[PDB]
Amino acid sequence: AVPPPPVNQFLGIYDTKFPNLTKADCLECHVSDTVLVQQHHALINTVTPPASCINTSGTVPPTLATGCHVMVPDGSGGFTFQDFRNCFNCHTQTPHHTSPAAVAKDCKYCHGNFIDNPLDGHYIPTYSASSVTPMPSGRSVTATDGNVVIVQGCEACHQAAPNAIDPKTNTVRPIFSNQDTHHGTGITDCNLCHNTSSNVPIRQCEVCHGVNSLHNIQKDSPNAANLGTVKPGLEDLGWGHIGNNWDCQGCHWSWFGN
Amino acid sequence: AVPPPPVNQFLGIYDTKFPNLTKADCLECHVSDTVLVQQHHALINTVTPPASCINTSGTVPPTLATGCHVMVPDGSGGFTFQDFRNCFNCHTQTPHHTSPAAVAKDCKYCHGNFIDNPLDGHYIPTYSASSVTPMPSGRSVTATDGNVVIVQGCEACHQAAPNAIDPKTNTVRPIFSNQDTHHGTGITDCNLCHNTSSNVPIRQCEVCHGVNSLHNIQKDSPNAANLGTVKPGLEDLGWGHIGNNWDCQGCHWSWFGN
Amino acid sequence: AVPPPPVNQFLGIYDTKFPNLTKADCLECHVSDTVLVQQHHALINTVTPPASCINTSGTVPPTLATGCHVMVPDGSGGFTFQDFRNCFNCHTQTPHHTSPAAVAKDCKYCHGNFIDNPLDGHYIPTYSASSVTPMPSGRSVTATDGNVVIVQGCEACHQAAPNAIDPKTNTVRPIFSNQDTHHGTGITDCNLCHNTSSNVPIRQCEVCHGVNSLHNIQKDSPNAANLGTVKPGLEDLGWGHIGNNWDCQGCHWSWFGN
Ligand code: HEC
Ligand code: HEC
Ligand code: HEC
Ligand code: HEC
Ligand code: HEC
Ligand code: HEC
Ligand code: HEC
Ligand code: HEC
Ligand code: HEC
Ligand code: HEC
Ligand code: HEC
Ligand code: HEC
Ligand code: HEC
Ligand code: HEC
């Protein structure tokens, strides 16, 4: 839980925050309200008795069986409408991960090629080796500058910086560690992440974090005489997984002695 | 032009008839003849040469410049007075809608809060949406029982029943459709009702039929466990605009398939 | 360069091929990959800045100063790993004979007792005799069946059969003659094999091919009433150096007249 000497890059797909900490700017993947209107009202024709245009039950999750629109009273009556421009008045949760996809475990669809589908049949390593092997959360060792630092694992650099971020959007989006961005999705299938095969700490994650998908996650170089087609060697320290030998060492070896 | 399964309620402000079909019972808003006497003769002192107490021109509209009282001859002379107890011998038209109010477009004054003043600056919807939107006169579609019925519009239930009414007064007062109760007021300002902005059929009416004023028009429930403070949900079918989802569907959606 | 009437036995220590013609079955003397993993990754801790886990220089000989693992791109990126299961992707040469042993001339270590260490101080014959003496490559004489055959020398039966072999492994392993299996080891120290002492053709080889080590090289008998503890007499024709008088004659005498 300590970023590279370059601050933990976030040119990846999703900022690691819980869904609730996303802004009302879901507009990039849900293009605009002008299409969202029909994207919602198309659902009224789904049921033969149409979906109630008004939400009289008041349940914060508006099941289409109930309604969406809520009419809140005002001074001297004045029934008004709470809101439908912002998205966090009715969804207010993880809307995805309950969809049809992420129920047949088709997580790769809509999560990018960063991940392999947990049922894709990709290559998982069969050998029971442990000499140079990465572990979830890694382990800690004393660095050359005294500070106890975690090495040989995903938590060696995937870290929770909650305070100072400056992503492209240039707001504050608090980064979160693992075991809350994966549990914050609200899935309850422990067979997926925490099965009990092989008694190797990383072989559970190897499903949908496979070898051929983990050794491709690399962003562009600032100055490495390539400026394109990132070579797996000869790159900056951080900026991905297969960039510089420092990365391979941080996830595979100790990189701080032992 | 077909009422709800409950006959088109008329607990609203005005029965939709033309002014002429009103009875001589203007007494509720013009309290009594005992005050109407001075309400009229007060106007004689307005002009410095007083208003002629007799109407010698015989013009059915008695301009105060002319007189009001008419002396009709009888058998063998016998000059008598036609009448001044009934109101339809001299007014016989729409007296309002030519007043100072309804000339500065202050229609809300004396028409209730049902309407917004056409110059009130109330909220008109700016988005050019059409998926679920109401239109004047609506459109027709085949109902589940064969009869072609109009839906998605004001004319979906605002209807001309000319024959059998039974209002509170328990007389026969023939209800009239739109485009004659609005034109029967005799205003000639087409800029008001039929302007040519936005090319949306209901955005013209949105002036003085606004969103915040149309979603409040709701009468009391017969049996909906409230009997007071009508909730926008959980009410009888008819009885207003924001009573039951059936209403919202009748004016917004189709409510009969498509 | 003609084998005994029994095909040139190969129950000896090493098949005479160059290192490259060895199969990926180095497993017998390097027991298994399961130990080879730590046999390699133990070397990363040797240097204080660890050995780069990735080979970015692309030099086919992977100096530990460089790395070993190479990531070759694929269709649409797809960085994959070339191989590390097979041994001929990185060694591809004579790996031995550059080791610490075979640099202090400790060739006997890891070559068996077949050889004496070139600095062992073993007995070399001091007498300048030539009557019955063996020579490298021998000399040729006409056999009893017309075919010119080489006799009185090591090349009298140490021969290059490149085509049909059938060793224990039962594959094809092309046997090679001398001056390429000794030069194919890639040593450049001519002082060792081709010194200029005594002007006797075999006294150069006598270093690390001494008398007491050359007169012990004998395999088991097929049928010689011993079937164990091979007697230097009374054995089959071939099958070693001190087996039958035919052997002593082939290396010492002519055995075909003169
Ligand atoms: C949940 C599936 C809904 C039901 C049932 C209904 N509406 Fe809806 N509506 C919903 C959302 C998420 C939004 C926001 C759209 C946006 O761009 O933010 C809306 C919006 C409207 C609007 C505004 C029109 C616009 O262009 O912004 C209207 C007039 C509207 N909805 C009407 C409406 C009616 C009449 C319904 C009953 C037939 C109805 N909605 C149901 C979600 C949902
Ligand atoms: C409450 C009024 C809502 C708000 C605010 C937003 N959404 Fe919504 N959304 C709502 C409901 C009731 C439903 C469907 C419920 C069901 O049972 O399916 C949805 C659905 C969507 C969908 C998926 C549509 C589908 O094909 O099933 C999308 C992509 C979606 N909503 C996007 C979205 C966005 C971007 C919003 C902020 C502008 C938003 N929704 C707000 C109810 C409500
Ligand atoms: C430091 C060398 C790291 C270690 C150890 C691990 N990861 Fe990593 N990862 C690292 C960087 C610099 C990035 C790019 C960040 C970005 O957002 O651009 C990544 C990215 C990922 C991703 C992509 C998702 C994303 O938000 O970008 C995944 C799915 C990922 N990393 C997984 C992962 C796993 C499972 C690890 C332990 C086996 C792990 N990473 C270790 C840097 C480092
Ligand atoms: C039009 C503005 C009028 C003029 C000019 C005059 N009168 Fe009138 N008068 C008018 C009305 C509408 C009525 C009906 C009042 C009612 O309650 O129905 C009347 C009535 C009278 C009466 C009856 C008195 C009564 O208590 O009912 C009288 C005696 C009368 N008017 C006299 C009168 C005179 C003398 C006028 C000239 C000075 C005169 N009126 C002018 C309307 C109008
Ligand atoms: C003809 C004899 C009339 C009869 C019958 C009634 N009204 Fe009248 N009314 C009459 C005139 C000539 C005028 C004023 C003309 C003008 O130029 O202003 C009126 C006016 C009124 C008014 C408004 C008074 C004002 O402040 O301007 C009211 C509220 C009114 N009248 C009511 C009224 C009622 C209820 C009547 C039936 C009982 C009635 N009027 C009859 C002439 C005549
Ligand atoms: C309540 C529903 C009403 C009934 C029934 C009638 N009138 Fe009316 N009238 C009403 C109001 C609120 C007003 C405006 C009051 C004001 O101060 O302006 C009026 C006004 C008139 C006028 C005045 C026109 C003018 O120039 O000011 C007239 C001439 C008039 N009313 C006539 C009239 C008649 C003949 C009616 C019976 C058919 C009648 N009114 C009924 C409210 C109501
Ligand atoms: C059926 C669902 C309706 C549709 C479609 C529209 N309206 Fe309506 N309206 C409806 C009822 C049952 C009532 C109460 C009737 C009463 O008189 O009590 C109303 C009332 C109004 C009113 C109040 C005036 C009145 O005389 O009561 C107004 C101004 C009104 N309605 C306007 C209106 C418009 C502009 C519509 C189309 C956009 C429309 N209504 C549709 C039932 C229904
Ligand atoms: C040359 C001395 C190497 C360096 C530097 C690194 N590795 Fe290696 N590795 C090497 C060989 C010859 C092999 C083959 C072992 C075998 O049995 O064939 C490997 C293998 C691996 C593996 C596979 C694990 C397994 O059990 O087969 C891994 C995961 C691996 N190496 C990782 C690794 C890392 C992370 C390194 C940098 C710290 C690294 N290797 C360096 C030779 C060499
Ligand atoms: C390239 C990825 C390699 C492959 C394939 C194999 N080996 Fe290797 N080996 C490699 C390097 C870079 C080194 C060390 C370099 C140095 O400077 O020392 C080695 C070393 C060995 C050793 C000796 C280890 C030592 O103590 O120094 C042995 C015994 C060895 N390698 C065996 C071996 C076998 C059997 C292989 C096929 C399975 C094999 N190596 C493949 C690089 C590579
Ligand atoms: C038995 C006949 C062997 C076979 C087959 C192979 N190797 Fe070997 N190797 C052998 C010995 C006895 C030793 C020395 C052991 C020691 O402790 O030094 C080696 C050593 C190596 C080395 C190390 C070189 C060094 O610098 O120390 C390497 C790199 C090596 N061997 C590679 C290697 C390869 C690639 C083989 C398959 C072609 C192979 N060896 C086979 C014994 C035997
Ligand atoms: C025919 C009589 C031979 C003559 C002449 C020489 N050698 Fe030989 N050698 C011979 C046999 C049948 C064998 C056994 C083969 C086997 O691989 O089992 C050998 C073996 C050796 C060896 C052992 C190495 C090996 O690969 O087995 C050595 C080191 C050796 N021979 C050396 C050698 C020398 C230096 C010779 C000339 C002085 C020579 N041999 C002659 C048969 C015959
Ligand atoms: C964390 C994101 C990693 C980084 C950085 C590197 N590797 Fe990796 N590697 C990682 C995992 C989770 C695994 C699977 C091992 C297991 O037991 O689950 C691997 C595996 C390898 C292998 C083995 C290949 C095989 O087929 O088994 C190799 C050869 C390997 N890794 C090489 C390697 C190199 C050279 C790296 C630096 C460029 C490197 N890895 C970084 C996780 C991560
Ligand atoms: C006819 C009297 C209507 C009934 C019954 C309902 N609505 Fe309505 N609505 C109506 C109009 C004329 C408009 C304006 C749309 C335009 O383009 O002019 C609307 C608008 C809405 C909106 C949009 C709110 C906004 O700020 O734009 C919503 C959310 C809405 N209406 C909801 C709604 C509900 C839930 C209803 C049933 C209780 C309902 N409307 C009934 C006309 C009428
Ligand atoms: C080739 C592998 C040989 C075979 C087969 C036999 N001998 Fe040998 N012998 C060989 C060499 C290279 C030498 C050294 C001679 C030199 O000048 O370098 C010898 C030497 C002898 C000796 C001399 C012993 C001494 O102390 O000098 C004897 C007595 C001898 N050899 C006997 C001998 C016998 C009896 C053999 C058949 C069983 C025989 N040799 C075979 C090489 C080879």
8-state DSSP, C4: -
Inter-residue contact C44 to A249 (CB < 8 Å):
no
- Residue that has been written with the tokens 């029943």 in this structure: B161
Nearest in space to B149 (alpha carbons), one of B252, B251, B1: B1
Q: How far apart are CA A178 and CA A189, in angstroms?
A: 16
Strands (E) across C20-156 are located at 71-74, 77-81, 139-142, 148-151
C-beta atoms of C50 and A253 within 8 A: yes
Nearest in space to C154 (alpha carbons), one of C220, C224, C101, C201: C201
Backbone angles phi, psi at B138, to 5 degrees: 60, -150
The CA-CA-CA angle for residues C66, C38, A201, to 5°, reads 105
Residue type, A30: H
DSSP of C53-71: SB--S--SS--TTS-SB-E
Experimental resolution (Å): 3.4
Strands (E) across chain A are located at 71-74, 77-81, 139-142, 148-151
Reported as type and span, the H/E element at residue C16 is none
C-beta atoms of B232 and A79 within 8 A: yes
Q: How far apart are CA B115 and CA C242, in angstroms?
A: 126
DSSP of chain B: ----SS-----SSS-SS-GGGS-S--TTTS--HHHHHHHHHGGGGTSSSPPPSB--S--SS--TTS-SB-EEEETTEEEEE--SSSSTTTT-S--TTSSSTTTSS--STTT-TTS--TTS------S---SS--BTT-EEEE-TTS-EEEESBGGGT-----S----TT-S------TTTTTTTT----HHHHS--STT-TTTTTTTTS-HHHHTS-B---SSSS-SSS--SSS--SSSBSSSSHHHHHHHTS-SS--
For ligand 13, atom 13, name the residue with the nearest CA: B211
Chain B neighbours (≥3 Cβ pairs under 8 A) are A
Inter-residue contact C107 to C208 (CB < 8 Å):
yes
Interface of chain A toward chain C, CB-CB under 8 angstroms: 127, 129, 131-132, 212, 215-216, 231-234, 242, 245, 248-249, 252-253, 255, 258
Q: Is B193 in the pocket of ligand 7 (CB under 6 A)?
A: no
A51 Cα nearest atom in ligand 2: 12
Signed CA dihedral, C75, C78, C79, C85: sign only: negative
B4 Cα nearest atom in ligand 7: 1
Number of H helices, E strands in chain A: 4, 4
C-beta atoms of A212 and C67 within 8 A: no
Best of C38, C71, C82 to mutate (most A CBs within 10 Å, chain A) = C71
Q: How far apart are CA B40 and CA C47, in angstroms?
A: 115
Residue type, B191: N
Grouping H, G, I as helix, E, B as strand and the rest as coil, residue C139 is: strand
> What is the best residue among B214, B218, B231, B255 to mutate for testing ligand 13's pocket, by most ligand atoms within 8 Å of CB?
B214
Backbone angles phi, psi at C45, to 5 degrees: -75, -10
- CA B2 centroid distance within chain: 18
Inter-residue contact C25 to C85 (CB < 8 Å):
no
**Residue B219 CB-half CA count within 13 A:** 14
C-beta atoms of B231 and A52 within 8 A: no
For ligand 9, atom 31, name the residue with the nearest CA: C40
Residue type, A45: N
Own/partner long-range contacts of B31-36 (Cβ < 8 Å, ≥24 apart): B33/B85
For the beta carbon of residue B129, count every other beta carbon within 10 angstroms. Answer: 14
C-beta atoms of A50 and B255 within 8 A: yes
B44 Cα nearest atom in ligand 4: 5
B12: CA distance to ligand 5 center in Å?
26
Inter-residue contact A230 to A220 (CB < 8 Å):
yes
DSSP of B27-52: TTTS--HHHHHHHHHGGGGTSSSPPP
Q: How far apart are CA C1 and CA C177, in angstroms?
A: 7
Instruction: Work out the burial of residue C106: count CB atoms within 10 Å of its CB; fewer than 13 is exposed, 13-18 middle, 19 or more buried.
Output: middle
Nearest in space to B21 (alpha carbons), one of B187, B155, B166, B162: B162
Nearest in space to C122 (alpha carbons), one of C105, C137, C110: C105
For ligand 1, atom 14, name the residue with the nearest CA: A84
Inter-residue contact B23 to B171 (CB < 8 Å):
yes
Nearest in space to A18 (alpha carbons), one of A159, A182, A170, A164: A182
Residue A249: which of C41, C50, C55 has the nearest Cβ?
C50
Q: Is A69 in the pocket of ligand 1 (CB under 6 A)?
A: yes
Residue B216 token pair: 């409040």
For the beta carbon of residue C217, count every other beta carbon within 10 angstroms. Answer: 17
Grouping H, G, I as helix, E, B as strand and the rest as coil, residue C151 is: strand
For the beta carbon of residue A116, count every other beta carbon within 10 angstroms. Answer: 22
Q: How far is CA A149 from CA A157, A246, B64, C49, in A?
A: 10, 15, 100, 18
Q: How far apart are CA C198 and CA C50, in angstroms?
A: 52
Pocket of ligand 2 (CB under 6 A): A 26, 30, 33, 36, 39-40, 43, 62, 64, 68, 84, 87, 89-91
Rg of chain C (C-alpha set)? 23
- Residue that has been written with the tokens 């000869």 in this structure: A234
Give A242's contacts in chain C (Cβ within 8 Å).
54, 71, 79
Grouping H, G, I as helix, E, B as strand and the rest as coil, residue A44 is: helix
Query: A65-88 burial string, b = 16+ CB within 10 Å, else e?
Result: ebbbbbbeeeeeeebbeeeeeebe
Grouping H, G, I as helix, E, B as strand and the rest as coil, residue C73 is: strand
Q: Give the max Cα distance, chain A.
A: 74
Q: How far apart are CA B196 and CA B201, in angstroms?
A: 9
Would you report the helix, strand and coil content of chain A in percent, each value rounded to 5? 15, 10, 80
